[PDB]
Each structure stands twice: as structure tokens, then as C-alpha cells.
């Protein structure tokens, strides 16, 4: 009979992608003092996220997202779900949130995978990847995905050896962009609607187009990739966010 | 000629998953007296569920759900549909519900299945599972699912003997998780949009990730698993719910 | 080349499933007089439907539906579409509908099919099924469905003899449910989004789960069944609806 | 090397299906004078459509649609897109439209196809079909559709002679309904979300059910039919629409 | 041992399709002062886009879109994402946007592909296509699309040579449309929900119907074409937009 050879994984920081749409009409028409009050509270919340990051308790990033799918991405990473629930609840109860609508979200956990043998969690070549720091500049590309389980294209029924080969080739394609595109892979198996969440960071959004298109020709993607929506956002420092909000 | 060998089942308590979204802006901006009044009335309702649970007439749990899919999960189990319709209507007419929006739900019945030899309804390891009590700590993972009926992967066309061997391997894979994960399977065949509802309980949400991912490599899941949305929530006792609502 | 052998059918009463969601917050917070006035008008409209049923000129049923998909199902059967258009338009124009939101619906016609030999519309064993009367108690299970037309599982390409064999087996499976489950099959080909509408009536909703699950193992269902959403509701007489509305 | 044999087509009048939902609560709660003023303006707009129809510059039809998908269908056929955009904009600007919400629509062009031999636009057996007149009575059945391109069932990869034989059989099945059902086929390739728009007109809606179901057994429909939603409406003359609006 | 041969691409201007729905009721019933102030502000915004285009630093187009999918399309092309984020942000905060609802959007980058060798960005047959100018008249047809990856129809698994042959045939079919239809292909791999965005410009919308239908018979489209929604709009100059808004 079929002998399962489950992929080995290591979990790192938990991740929450919080996408929201801005009610432009309501925000820009609100009394200036009300907007300033909301602005002070918002900055205070973000300073707290920054504080946690400096204490090595997570990472975060806020982005201006292009298109109708979302306007602002509040990305947070923490040591567990509770701190994420906290960050999410606090944002949701903020005065600024009164002018926002949740459009999409994703709960996942930083995942390091290995198809054949378990990874050494204490290896200096593995451990740092468990707690990725979000770049404070550039752009981000986020998209969820599953590994196909259809007809003759069933990733989960393949022998571990074949999966290892397919993943190695995929990793090699990705490394052509070493130093150009940073990648954070998170798993949402049993946690959200898709099996993985993927974050790509770069100083030029065109790099996202180059790497994603090229990777689609790797057999692992061509035959086994099932992709969800793609969100592209530009990193916003405090001043950039202030300008975005018209303050 | 095809001869059907339908899976044997034993039905237990009826189950209702009631997912709702909180209108943060309206709730946190509402007069303090209005919030307190809604809170007092909510406690009275939850007290009824508590007393019913103490009497062995059902069970319940309230959770803080991560993400945009839902904010609060009101889980209730009863000996029939009527008590569920009652609990559901009572919550909906409460003052607190004026600040809630229904985002998702699932109606199902606790189900114990056997592919070949019928289960002993009197077995001490069978009977108690018909009336599972919701644990009072940790987290919950809920997701609905169907058994695939596509091309060569048609679960319902398989001989009972093959389905039995497929389920045995599944049960084996999940045995290593028994110590950390509790599982409640409910059937919604002619009751809701998916064939089964699955509730996983654990003190660590990462356990949900490990078990769901590892199980996907079992042939039963890899070839016949069709999965719906995944919701993760943190169990909230009275004080936790109060704190979440800012009271 | 291909010689079609279309299924023979007899059409009876037209059917309209009108599913609505109740705005609990607005209804239960509305002034008593407005509620009583809306209730008086609603009773009168339903009374008209009841009088038509008593005259043997149609049938109706109002149900409390579990879950977020709908709260109230207004089921009506008439000799044609015109009185159904009236039924829904009048409910929508009622004051009570100011507190309702249309969530789903289905327009179909009671259909009695035969794969090979045409049915006799004047036969004592056939004619009565053309104008079924909705049970004035118990519960209802409604779900729409199609007959699969994919790859090797193409119902419409099958010879009539094979379809007759598949349907006969389906009939044998449901025979043991004769005394506990009433079934009404209606066709919506060219009338709505699905090919058929299925109504199951029983004094116990668990019977819906039992029959639907068991039948899924019949080849006709396993290979050719394509199912839509499932709605379960409890029949409400006048006093039960009054109580549901808090009056 | 695949040699394409594209279907020959002749284009006639452009077509717009404008489906809207009526805000019953708001309309029937509005002051009687406001309703009358809106009605008078609406009649005037429709009178304009009737005038151009009498001049032979188009055709129109307004229907009361069953179910939640739509309440009113404003069907218009014109020599081009511009006059359709005008009729669409004029209706949207009307006071009556303040009580309407767009639920669905379809932009297409009357199409007469031929798989092998090109059609003569001046032929008396072809020309009149380019500018069909909407029956001023009865009912309508509208549904968009595509020709399947999946696996072994790829309509667009077939040789023209096969497509011709497949369409011939379809026509033979439909000749039976010639005196009871009138059909208008419009193409929306490159114009809307589906490849074709299909309008069926008849004095009895059951005829729609009969023809659509029987045709599904033809190989062209069974293997290559990909159907969208089905809308059924009752033709409304001026007096009937007035009655529907409670005036 | 599959060896990937990824398609080479040259990237030109970044493109943003911003589709919005007009709240007709709110706009046309709003005070004249409000409408005029909004119009004057919108004109100023568009003038900035116009001047930008005159300086060869981009291109734009505003269209009246037929149907319920959108009413106005604000199309913009710029040297990067930043200018696009600025354009949609500026439009979103305008007084006019208070009367608009975002219904759809697409972020992509003009793409010139070549299946086997790098293209020369300086060739007189290549360079101009990198910065396409939106025609100031006629109509537009927009639709997103993917290249199929299903079973035996997997574009990404094909040898580069075969993909070249398929595309060459596609180009030969489009030859006859040379002087009637202008096409701009943009890639959104890693940028949006579909792999490509396609814009067709013509003085007659029927040309869109002719070319899209004919091309569907080419093997590349028949077997590998996966199409999204289709939008058709009429180009509006300042005067036409003014008239559309009743000013």
C-alpha cells in the first residue's frame, strides 16, 4: 500500500496579514481634530509594534496597496497567536479603524520545510530564518497558495524523493534573485484557507513579476502550483503614512 | 453492476457553529450604559447554556477568532435541532447582537463512523464520543470537508474494504497527536453545504498545523480530501470575553 | 451519430422557494405598534395562501431556517408562475419585509420523470404526485442539484437503459425511508441556476442526514450527483411564527 | 499542425440585458406623489423606446423577474453600443432608478452563425433574423453560455464538419418547438463574461423547461454546454408595470 | 528530467485599470454647488494626467463602461508603480469619488514576450511598444487572462519551441485586424490575480467580437486560454464626460 513520507517542517514566528480598505470619503471629510486624534493613536500603536521588534519579539510592516483589493496592509509577526490577536484587536478598536473595512486577511506561521530529513533547529544556517525581520523600505508581494492534488498532478501522493528534487530545482530558480528579492514562506495548513502564505520583498516591484513568471516554468509550479490573489504594496514609514492620510 | 456498501454511522448531539463579526466602531463608541446592559444580558444567556451543560443537556464554547472571516465563534451542542434554533434565535435577538454580523455558520450532527463492522453503541470508547463536551481552555480549529467524487478519485464508489484500509491509516497517523489534539467529527450530509464538520481542540494552535499537514500525506486525504475554510479561535472564559469587549 | 433518448417528464405545480434573513436588531427594537401592524398584514397574506391550499388550489409552508444562509423560508406551490410572482412581490411589499433581506430563492416545477416508458398523467399512482401538499408539521430539507456532465461521468450522454438502471437502484435505496421521509422533486432546467430542486420532509431532521448520506453511495449519486447548498428548516404554524417574532 | 476553421458569423442589432432589483421597502414607503412623479417619468422614457421600435430602429421589453436574482429586466436592442449606453444611462438617471439596484447585466450582439458555409446577409431567410422584435406578451428566459474547452470536450479544437453535424442535430431537436418558442442568439465574445447570450420567448414558461431539458441530451449540449444563470420573467405592458409598482 | 525554458520579457510602462461604479442617485440629486466643485476638481486632476502624457511621461484614458460591472474606467500608464499609486489615491480622495464605488481594478506592466531569445529593447519594432499611447477616441475592451495548466493542456510545461509555434499562429490570425484593432498586452504575474491584462482599442466594438471569437479557434487559445471578465467602454473626452455627468 501507499507509504506516506510527510514533509518535515520547523515553525517560527506566527504571521498575520491584515488587509483593509480606507473609506476615503469619510476620512478626508472628517473634522481635522478627529483625524489628528486618530493619527496620534495610530502612531502610538505602531510605535508599540516597533518596540516589540526592538525587543526581538516580532516584526511588522505597513504598506499602501495598489488596486481595489485593499488599500493598507498591516503585517505583523509574533512568537504566537495571542500576541497577534492582541495587535489585531487593538488596531480594530482604534479610532482610525472606524474609517477602515477589512477586505482580506491571512493567518500563518513561518515555515522551513525539508522533504526527506528533519532540519536542525539550532543550526546557524536554519535558526535565523525562523524569525524574519520585515524590510523597512521597498515593496511587498503577498499571495497564498496550495500544492495541487488533482488527477495525475497530486503533490501529496508523490514520493519524498521526487518532492525533494522538484523543490531543489525551485529553490535554485529563486536563488537567481539572491540579494534582489527576499522570500518568507509561511504555512497555514489547518490555520487558514490556503496551505501557504508567501511574502516577497524587493526594492522594485518588477522583480516580483520577473521571479513569479520565471518560477512558473519550474515543474513544481507548472504542475503543482495553485495560486490565490496577489497583493502588491509599497512600504510606508511614518511620514509616508502621514502623507497618504493627508495629514 | 455496482453494489453499494454504505458507511455505518451513529449520531450523537446536534452541533451549531455560529460565527459572527464584531462591529468594533459601533460597539466601542456606544454609550457605556448601553454596553454594560448588553453585557449583562449576554451573561444571562451564556449562563443558561452553562446550566444546560452542567445538567448534561449539551455543551458550548465561545471563541475569539483570528482574521477577517469571523471575530467570535459561538459553538453549541444539543440533543436536537430545536434547542439549537432556540440558542441561535436568543443570541440574535440580544442587544449585543445589534453590534454583530453573521459571517458563517454550520449545522451538523456528531457522527461516529465505521466502514465495515458496525460500532458498538454501548462501548465505553464509543458512547462518550456521541456527547462530546467542549474543552474550557486552549484553542479550536474548525473546518468543513467533503469526500471527493472526481474521476479516478471517487470515494463513494470504492469498496467498503478499501475505504476501511484508507481510514485505518488515517487513524494511525493521528494517533501520535492524541495527547495534544482532541477531535470531534460531525456529519452535515443533508444538513448543510459540506458533508462533515471537523473540530480540533488543543492548547497550541501549531498542533493544528502539524496534524492537518501530516494527514494530507495519507492517501485518504491526498486523494479524497476536499477542504473548506479553516477558522482558528482562542477559548474565552467570562473574564476573557469581558476584556475583549473592553469591559 | 449520437441518438438522444431524452428523459420523459410530467409537470405539476410550479414551486417557489423564497428564503429571507431577518434583521433581528431592527425588528426587535422597532416600536410595538409597528411590529403588531406588520404582523397583522403578514398573517393576512399567509391566510390567503392557506385558504388557497384548503381549496386544493396550491400549497404553502413557512419555516424557521438554521444558520446564516436564511432565517425564514416561504414555500409556495401554484398551478403556474404568475401566482408565485405575486407571492414574492406581495411579501416584499409587506411592512414585515422592511425587516427582511432576500438571501436565496429557487423557481422550479414539480417533475415526475421516467427514463424509458412514458408515465400516465391520469394514473392513480402518478397524478397525485403532480400536486403535493406541504406537511403542516415537522421539518424540511431543501437542496438544488445537477446531473454531472464531466469526462467519463456524463449523465446526459448515457443510454436511457443505463439511466433507468441507475434510477431504479436509487429508488430501492430510498424505499426504507418511505414512512419517514416525503420527497418532492421539481425541475428547473431553463428556469433557474440548477437542473432540479429537491424538498425532503420529515418529523426528524436526522432522517435527512441518513437518507442523503446513504444515497451518496448509489452509483447514480456517487458518479453523477452535483449538489448545491442545503437548507434545513422547522415548520412554523401561525402561533410558532408569532412567538418567533416575539409577539 | 492545427488548421483553424472559425465559425462564420453575421452581426445584427446590439443587445443589452439590464437586470435590477427593486428596493420594495423604500419604494412603497415613499410619498405617493414622489412615486407618481417617478412613474410618469419612467413611462416617458419607455414611450421613447416604443417610438424607436415603431420606427424600426430597435426593440425593447420590460419583465417582472422571478426570484432573488432580479426583479425587473429592461431588455433593449439597438443598431449599436452608443444608443444602448444612452438608454442605460437615461434609466439610471431616472427618479425611479433611485429605488433600483443593478444585480446583473449582459452586453451582446445578435449573431447568426454557420460552421461551414458563410451566410448571405441579404437572404430573406437570414436578413430578418438580424433585427429581431421582442414579443409584446408572454415570458422570457435568459441565460448566457460558453462552448466547453476542457480535456476531450473542446469545442474550439473540433473540425468545422463535426461542429456542423453537432449543430444540425441541435436544430432538429428544436424544430419541434418552432410554433411555441422564439429564440434570439447573441454573441458576447470580447464583449462580456460569456461567449453567448440566449433569449427564449414563449407564452408558457413550462416550454422553456421542456426545450432546455430535451436539448441537454443532444451531444452538442451534453458534452459542450457550459451554462450560466437562468432568468425567467413575465412580459409587462404599461398597465402591468404600473400595477407591479402599486400604482 | 524536465528542463525549463522560461519566456524572456521586456517590461515597459506600468498600467492601472481603475474601474468604478457611479452612484447615479446620489450624484444627480446632489446640490449643484457640490457637483460643480467636484467636476472642477476632477478636471484639474485629469489635466495633470493629460500634461503628463503630452510630456511623453505616460498615458491615460477615461471610458464609459457598459453594464453592471463598472460605469467608468480610469486607465493610466506610468514609468512605475509609485505614480500609479498616486493617481488612484488622488482620484480616491477627490470630491467626485465620494459618488463612486470601486468595482474592479488591475495592476500590470506592459510586456513584450519572446519564447526563445532576449528581445532587443532598441529595435524600431520593439521600443515604441514599451510605451503605448492610449487612443483619444473609439472604444476599449479589457480582459485579464492566464495560460492553462491543467492535465494535458499545460502551457508552462511545453517546450519553448512549441510555445513559439503556437504564438506565431496566434499572431498570423490577428494580422487581418492590423489597421482596425490596437492591442496592448501587460503582464501581472506576481502583481495581480491574473497572469496578463489585455487591452484592445478600436473605433468599432464589433471588431472586439470578431477578433476574440476568431482567435478562440487558434490552438493556443482553444487549449491554453483561460479568460477573466470582459469590459467594454467608450472613450470620453472632457466634453463627453461633462455631458455624462449631467453638467
From Swiss-Prot, chains A, B, C, D, E:
One of its GO terms (biological process) is heme biosynthetic process. The keyword Heme applies. Pathway: Porphyrin-containing compound metabolism; protoheme biosynthesis. InterPro entries: CHDC (IPR031332), ChdC/CLD (IPR010644), Dimeric_a/b-barrel (IPR011008). Its cofactor is Fe-coproporphyrin III. The keyword Iron applies. One of its GO terms (molecular function) is peroxidase activity. It is an enzyme of class 1 (oxidoreductase). Keywords: Heme, Heme biosynthesis, Iron, Metal-binding, Oxidoreductase. The active site is at 143. Its EC number is 1.3.98.5. Fe-coproporphyrin III binds at residues 129, 143-147, 170, 183, 221. SUPFAM superfamilies: Dimeric alpha+beta barrel (SSF54909). It catalyses: Fe-coproporphyrin III + 2 H2O2 + 2 H(+) = heme b + 2 CO2 + 4 H2O; Fe-coproporphyrin III + H2O2 + H(+) = harderoheme III + CO2 + 2 H2O; harderoheme III + H2O2 + H(+) = heme b + CO2 + 2 H2O. Disulfide bonds: none annotated. Fe-coproporphyrin III acts both as a substrate and a redox cofactor. Was originally thought to use heme as a cofactor. Homopentamer. Involved in coproporphyrin-dependent heme b biosynthesis. Catalyzes the decarboxylation of Fe-coproporphyrin III (coproheme) to heme b (protoheme IX), the last step of the pathway. The reaction occurs in a stepwise manner with a three-propionate harderoheme intermediate. When reconstituted with heme, can generate oxygen using chlorite or hydrogen peroxide as substrate (in vitro), but has very low affinity for hydrogen peroxide and chlorite and extremely low enzyme activity. Belongs to the ChdC family. Type 1 subfamily. HAMAP family: Coproheme_decarbox_1 (MF_01442). This is Coproheme decarboxylase. It comes from Thermus thermophilus (strain ATCC 27634 / DSM 579 / HB8).
Amino acid at each position: 500500500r501507499h507509504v506516506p513520507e510527510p514533509t518535515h517542517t520547523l515553525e517560527g514566528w506566527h504571521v498575520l496579514h491584515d488587509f483593509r480598505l480606507l473609506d476615503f470619503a469619510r476620512w478626508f471629510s472628517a473634522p481635522l481634530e478627529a483625524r489628528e486624534d486618530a493619527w496620534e493613536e495610530l502612531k502610538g500603536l505602531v510605535r508599540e509594534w516597533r518596540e516589540l521588534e526592538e525587543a526581538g519579539q516580532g516584526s511588522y510592516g505597513i504598506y499602501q496597496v495598489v488596486g481595489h483589493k485593499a488599500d493598507l496592509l498591516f503585517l505583523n509577526l509574533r512568537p504566537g497567536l495571542d500576541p497577534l490577536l492582541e495587535a489585531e484587536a487593538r488596531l480594530s478598536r482604534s479610532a482610525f479603524a472606524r474609517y477602515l473595512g477589512r477586505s482580506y486577511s491571512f493567518y500563518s506561521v513561518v515555515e522551513l520545510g525539508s522533504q526527506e530529513k528533519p532540519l536542525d533547529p539550532e543550526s546557524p544556517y536554519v535558526k535565523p530564518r525562523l524569525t524574519p525581520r520585515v524590510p523597512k523600505s521597498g515593496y511587498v508581494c503577498f499571495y497564498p497558495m496550495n500544492k495541487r492534488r488533482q488527477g495525475q498532478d497530486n503533490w501529496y501522493m508523490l514520493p519524498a524523493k521526487e518532492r525533494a528534487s522538484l523543490m531543489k530545482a525551485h529553490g535554485e530558480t529563486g536563488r537567481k534573485y539572491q540579494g534582489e528579492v527576499m522570500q518568507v514562506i509561511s504555512g497555514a495548513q489547518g490555520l487558514d484557507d490556503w496551505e501557504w502564505g508567501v511574502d516577497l520583498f524587493s526594492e522594485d516591484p518588477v522583480q516580483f513579476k520577473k521571479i513569479v513568471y520565471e518560477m512558473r516554468f519550474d515543474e513544481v509550479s507548472a504542475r503543482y502550483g495553485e495560486f490565490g490573489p496577489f497583493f502588491v504594496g509599497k512600504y510606508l514609514d511614518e511620514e509616508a503614512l502621514r502623507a497618504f492620510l493627508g495629514l
